[PDB]
Design a protein around this ligand. Structure first.
Ligand SMILES: OC[C@H]1O[C@H](O[C@H]2[C@H](O)[C@@H](O)[C@@H](O)O[C@@H]2CO)[C@H](O)[C@@H](O)[C@@H]1O
Ligand SMILES: OC[C@H]1O[C@H](O[C@H]2[C@H](O)[C@@H](O)[C@@H](O)O[C@@H]2CO)[C@H](O)[C@@H](O)[C@@H]1O
Ligand SMILES: [Ca+2]
Ligand SMILES: [Ca+2]
Lengths: 588, 588
């Protein structure tokens, strides 16, 4: 009995409200150390207040071992209680047959447990739906497409910045290059987006900013003049909505650009500036020593994003900053009807501000989607009062490491199970899955131009619980290393486009939207069936979707499925190295 | 290497902000499984952005094993970072000499760790003081006195309820008895309170309510007429403040009494009532089947506290209820200058309301003290955005179980260490310690009238990090079983008072306020020196307070201290069973 490996944290992802009378409860144990876990649960007041001789601890509820991360096992159970008050404890039995009760009071023999004392148990005191996590349903049926607007399509040469280069997808872009992409180009290629089958557009920042990336905001209340104007953006949003495509914008609230009005005021008036307290200035005047790298300063007298002097950090604890940012976030939603906000460097802004932001957005749109850009563990931002989800960088990163390196299938399945057990079930369905972006090398480059490997990575990711996204140009096999090489002008020429990959992407998106998205309360199972061989199963009460991935150096034979949805090998039974097959079957 | 017993939860009690540039970080391991833990910590951006060859992971920080609960060991370290951004990982070495790195990515050999990737580490993204827990300093120097107003002192026979019984401390009170205690009696005995040395008064509810306990509120905006009026309560608060005594009131917001205006409106107008949505009514009309027990109904059509039909539960998610309760809480503080709120059944009210309540109170008084009445684990209410502390029922309950039963000293020390490791350090100093109350048997009754045992329990509790409280009459040795027997009229007669215990209580309070309260950032150590023998040490840089408690069946000899503060045996070296000795010594 590895008692040190057993843990339950109440009022957490291990004990949360699903609906008015229902809760989900989890227990962590040491891997393969516990053979069974039962839950003793009921109304805490029923023990001594009800005249009945029956007590809730006399009818245990069996828990199911749902996941394992190589170190711990994870058990779960769902409990319904009409009184909406729950006290609970765990009955754990290990390999040697040693059984103990685990409660808020610790570990006991069942004979020594004070089961009649309501304060012996862990507690969910009252099922508070106002405190619970809620997931917007529409996100479940979405496949996103990420657009870096400067490089997607130039629909208007008239607004091009000075020195705009000729549109060349084969170019290796420089850090300060401009190609002239704008909102009119996105409006022009909405038909390509709809033919691909995507139902959501994620835009990198489009607010006035001097750079090609626009993360150094100059004015949050105005669309960049090179990109277009307010009327054109409203037209774009309405056309997207007409095509059944939702819109998500990028909010850069952790820092502002140095060319912004507030910062220039700070540079002119120093401490006498009204915006001095909008920033984190250690010493006046706000200064820094320039270096050869434009994005690096070693001795700035003010806090900044990374070590770049051009992005002074905003003081989100200042009430004036709070009001300003909330007004911006409310303005874009209320005036242009956007569907989601993507929060840049969301982890470096305080929870207090995010709580206010969540309240404002939900007061505007109850089904709003708040996505946080965080690379590490975000349990504190996904309780239900702040973000809906975060970018699932660790999940897709583990997937990429498995497919590109020679790691065992067990390692990948353990990493994915750890990730899933970090959060609530619905939160897991809201996580944002992308294999590359404007900050990482392109998938085709990562796969060393191995198309089959890229198809396998994309299919494996699209089968995951989170919502998938396609970085612009992935559907045509665009290559590139890290930024700025991952921001090449979009390949609009047919001679340079991979049409086979585009056809495959259309089929993959169709499988995601017509099959995996229509599963009802599906369960996910990871099975390691051999060295670098994985069987993924998503299963609801009526239908089951199975995908087998052969990433070994040998052929793999499977029983012939009756209805194959997607496969790369011509055979219906044999899988060569890097092949995969997806099929569907009724539950029996 | 028991890897399953090792856990760090970021942005928790295991990783929190102490001040603008300082954080505390904890690690849990399996007991006696890990021989050492180092912390690798630094600015996450410094790894690849600074041109230096020096990296923060090359200079580890040693962690100290601070606590152990019999199952796990708890290590802690304090880290200062001028950039106010922290990435960190743990270097753990077990009994066999196996060393591994533990990060947000899992467990690795140091050779296989991607130490140059900032996303490999756990993260405190930016030190947010607006999100941090703050403890009001004055609480550290307080010793509370809890008054059940109906039974403390009758200062006015004119306001006595009908059928008020003659004041008799030897009576066994009935559930619906009245003795006539009021606010004028508290005003009359403030001198007794000041002579005892207490600096805080905790009052049970004084708002208009029909019962002797007043937890079935009729009107929150008015002092009960039997108790007094607004002018008398203002006089009481100002006299207490004049004597250096703070005032804490009892807020019963989870439920309202059935004689209240809102409930009577619901009983008259049913669903047409404007207050229908202020409650949790499952079926109209709101009804129940009466039983022989006035406080029990098996089939009420509305949610209530416990199973009593007279306390319908308030719907704290309704904005009108939120506004009403916030107005009440603001009114008593702003108009009468009370110093603290004690929140009745605080766990059954949602976090959203408590966040609003905290914000309102702190906007009124930055040093306000919010105490939650919760019997189980309250990690979710003590993050710093809701309560300051909770009633420390589990801690004092473990102490009582040790002193009254024959449990080993190891068990008590493990329970106390588990409790301390559940929360932040400052939170531990804010917890409210009382050995009995109006809901539990009196200490003298629990000790079977063994005065020495009661003195030992009280001294041991007063040496703990939390703030101590004295239930009225404890200083005179009042007896009684559970409520209503624990609510006997206060013993004002000298022939029935234990003067020896009163003298001892004065000395104990003086030791707490003049010595233990003046320790600066003191450290607490539990040492088991023998079967049922405990050495408690509180130690700052300059002074150290030691207390030895002999709870065995044999004599214990100690070296003669130079400055004894408190002892029960006449010898300065020998401790007989149930004896204890407290002394002080300089740190060397
Ligand atoms: O000038 C620094 C940096 O700014 C942008 O980087 C973004 C990044 O793209 C976002 O995903 C997030 O991590 O915040 C960063 C700062 O806002 C540019 O994209 C990048 O090229 C540039 O170096
Ligand atoms: O009528 C039920 C009950 O009401 C009060 O109990 C309080 C208790 O004293 C508080 O500490 C807290 O737990 O909430 C309870 C309900 O407000 C009376 O004190 C008790 O005698 C009575 O039975
Ligand atoms: Ca253009
Ligand atoms: Ca009276």
């Amino acid at each position: 009995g590895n008692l040190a490996g057993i843990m339950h944290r109440p009022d957490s992802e291990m004990a949360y409200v699903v609906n008015e009378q229902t809760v989900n409860i989890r227990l962590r144990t040491a891997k393969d150390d516990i053979v069974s876990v039962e839950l003793l649960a009921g109304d805490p007041y029923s023990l001594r207040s009800l005249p009945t001789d029956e007590k809730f601890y006399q009818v245990p509820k069996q828990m199911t071992k749902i996941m394992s991360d190589g170190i711990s096992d994870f058990w779960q159970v769902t409990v319904t209680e009409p009184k909406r008050r729950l006290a609970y404890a765990f009955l754990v039995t290990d390999m040697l047959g040693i059984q103990k009760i685990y409660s808020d009071k610790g570990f006991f023999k069942v004979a020594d447990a004070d089961l009649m004392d309501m304060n012996f148990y862990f507690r969910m005191p009252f099922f508070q739906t106002i405190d619970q996590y809620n997931a917007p349903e529409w996100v479940t049926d979405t496949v996103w497409y990420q657009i870096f607007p400067e490089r997607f399509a130039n629909g208007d040469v008239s607004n091009d910045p000075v020195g705009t280069k000729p549109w060349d997808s084969t170019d290796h872009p420089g850090r300060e290059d401009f190609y002239g992409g704008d909102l009119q180009g996105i409006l022009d290629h909405l038909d390509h987006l709809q033919e691909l089958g995507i139902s959501g557009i994620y835009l990198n920042p489009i607010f006035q900013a001097p750079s090609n990336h626009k993360y150094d905001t100059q004015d949050y209340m105005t669309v960049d003049p090179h990109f277009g104007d307010a009327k054109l953006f409203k037209q774009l949003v309405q056309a997207a909505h007409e095509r059944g495509i939702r819109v998500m914008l990028d909010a850069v609230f952790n820092h502002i650009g140095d060319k912004s009005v507030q910062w220039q005021d700070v540079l002119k008036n120093e401490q006498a500036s009204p915006y001095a307290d909008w920033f984190h200035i250690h010493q006046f005047p706000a200064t820094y020593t320039p270096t050869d790298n434009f994005e690096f300063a070693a001795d700035a007298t003010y806090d900044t994003f990374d070590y770049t002097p051009h992005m002074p950090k905003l003081n989100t604890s200042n009430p004036e900053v709070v009001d300003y940012l909330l007004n911006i976030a409310t303005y874009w939603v209320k005036e242009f009807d956007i569907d989601a906000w993507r929060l840049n460097v969301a982890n470096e802004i305080d929870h207090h501000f995010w709580r206010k932001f969540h309240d404002a957005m939900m007061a505007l749109k109850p089904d709003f989607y708040i996505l946080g850009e965080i690379w590490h563990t975000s349990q504190s931002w996904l309780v239900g009062d702040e973000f809906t989800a975060v970018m699932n960088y660790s999940y897709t990163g583990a997937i990429l490491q498995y497919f590109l390196e020679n790691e065992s299938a067990d390692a990948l399945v353990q990493k994915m199970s750890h990730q899933l057990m970090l959060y609530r079930d619905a939160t897991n369905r809201m996580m944002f899955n992308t294999v590359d972006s404007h900050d990482t090398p392109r998938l085709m480059t990562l796969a060393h131009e191995d198309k089959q490997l890229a198809k396998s990575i994309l299919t494996f990711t699209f089968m995951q619980p989170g919502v998938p996204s396609i970085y612009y140009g992935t559907e045509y096999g665009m290559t590139g290393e890290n930024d700025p090489d991952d921001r090449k002008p979009m390949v609009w020429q047919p001679e340079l486009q991979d049409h086979d990959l585009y056809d495959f992407m259309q089929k993959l998106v169709q499988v995601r939207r017509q099959v995996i998205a229509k599963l009802s309360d599906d369960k996910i199972i990871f099975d390691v069936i051999g060295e670098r061989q994985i069987r993924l199963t998503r299963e609801d009460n009526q239908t089951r979707i199975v995908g087998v991935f052969n990433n070994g150096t040998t052929d793999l034979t499977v029983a012939q499925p009756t209805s194959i949805l997607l496969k790369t090998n011509q055979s219906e039974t044999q899988l060569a190295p890097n092949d995969f097959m997806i099929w569907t079957e009724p539950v029996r």
